[PDB]
């Protein structure tokens, strides 16, 4: 119902934070730094939560609403997946190659949802 939208400045600024943290996650995947995934995921989650808060809850333009849940949904999945690097009992096996792909996939989804939001927001802010 609320079509108020954040500042373009603000979105970009928050977008840059998300992108920086996900980049750090990517490098750690490339580096097989699996013990970095949980702290990276925390930083991404924070960054996501702040960007989603630039918009009113139940905002108005449908594509803003579609993008936000996908942004929020994906941040939630990334955190969950990342915790799985920590096995059930100590010295339990972990399929790190599969998990890492699941992790990166989730990160893709975040970047995707963020760009969607950037695109709609920068756009609506002209006419």
């Amino acid at each position: 119902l609320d079509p108020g939208l954040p500042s373009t400045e603000d979105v970009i600024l928050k977008t840059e934070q998300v992108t920086k943290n996900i980049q750090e996650l990517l490098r750690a995947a490339q580096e097989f730094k699996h013990d970095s995934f949980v702290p990276c995921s925390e930083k991404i989650h924070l960054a996501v939560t702040e960007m989603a808060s630039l918009f009113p809850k139940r905002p108005a333009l449908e594509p803003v609403r579609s993008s936000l849940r996908l942004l929020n949904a994906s941040a939630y999945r990334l955190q969950s997946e990342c915790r799985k690097t920590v096995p059930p009992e100590p010295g339990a096996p972990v399929d790190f190659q599969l998990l890492t792909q699941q992790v990166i996939q989730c990160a893709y989804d975040i970047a995707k949802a963020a760009k969607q939001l950037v695109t709609i927001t920068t756009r609506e802010k002209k006419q």
């Binding site: 979105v11 840059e16 996900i22 990517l26 990166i104 996939q105 990160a107 950037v118």
Partner: peptide
Amino acid sequence: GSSATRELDELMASLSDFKMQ
């Protein structure tokens, strides 16, 4: 926001390439 999106597209290309090697 173009550069915002370009930086996002840059990151998405990198992530999906990691998924395609």
